[PDB]
Chain A
Amino acid sequence: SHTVKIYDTCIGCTQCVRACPTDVLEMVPWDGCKAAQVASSPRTEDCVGCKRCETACPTDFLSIRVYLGAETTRSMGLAY
């Protein structure tokens, strides 16, 4: 699957979780930002790699990054 990693410059504005079409991302409790929340990627096996989360991220270069990796039926987005 692809690898989605969240860096510590997150501000917890939850926009990556909203942008995600395949439910990879979720918000968890945290204490390193004012909103007290980071994004987390437990379901990277559902990640198709479309990078809407990186489009949605407001920090100057990307608290979240998708690293494209091996291809599966889910990551290639095949209905067949």
Chain B
Amino acid sequence: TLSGKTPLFAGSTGGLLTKAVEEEKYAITWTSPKAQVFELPTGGAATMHEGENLLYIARKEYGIALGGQLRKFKITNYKIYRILPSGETTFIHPADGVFPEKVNAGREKVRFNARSIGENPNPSQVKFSGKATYDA
């Protein structure tokens, strides 16, 4: 599914546990101009390869911490995948193809409230109704 070389480190005990085989698993891919040393989110030092890299991780936050670190190495082509135990690989970051800090067309407003927050109703007005005060 995913093409890449595992970075060079002698293994840690901070890697990925039984949740990977039973619940969900993440992968990060990036390419590097040269081979250089980076820090794992699990702890420890590892050498990335000159070329395509692949590093399986337990949480998505590990991949976004690593992708924030890879920007210091001037590497902005990183991709984060979500892998299920069925083998289902889905592409989540960046999902649109553009990083979320930049505006891209085709994105819609999700969970936008067209009022200020002091204009939310009282909790007693929404009591027993099954809705929250901040809904809609």
Contact = CB atoms under 8 A, between A and B. Distances in A.
B72 interface: no
A70 interface: no
B112 A8 contact: yes
Contacts of A30: 109
A41 B111 contact: yes
B100 interface: yes
Contacts of A26: 96, 100, 107
Nearest to B114: A8
Interface stretch (B4-12, B28-36, B46-54, B59-67): B59-67
Majority DSSP secondary structure for residues of A touching B: loop
B92 A77 contact: no
B103 interface: yes
B102 interface: yes
B107 A40 contact: yes
Contacts of A79: 16-17, 19, 58-59
A38 to B, nearest CB: 6
**Chain A: interface size category:** 35 or more
B103 A23 contact: no
B2 interface: no
Nearest to A78: B19
B115 interface: yes
Contact of A14 (B60, B96, B101): B101
Counting chain A CB atoms within 10 Å of each CB, which of B18, B92, B100, B132 scores highest? B100
Given A17-B101, A37-B103, A73-B19, A62 B60 contact: no
Interface of B: 16-19, 23-24, 58-61, 64-65, 80, 92-96, 100-103, 105, 107-118, 132, 134
Given A7-B116, A27-B100, A40-B109, 4 more contacts: A5-B134, A7-B117, A23-B92, A46-B60
Q: Which 4 A-B pairs have the closest CB atoms?
A: A26-B100, A79-B58, A28-B107, A42-B110
27 contacts: A3-B111, A3-B134, A4-B111, A6-B112, A7-B115, A7-B116, A8-B113, A8-B114, A14-B101, A18-B101, A26-B96, A27-B103, A29-B103, A29-B105, A30-B109, A36-B103, A38-B109, A40-B108, A61-B117, A61-B118, A67-B132, A73-B24, A77-B59, A78-B19, A79-B17, A79-B19, A80-B18
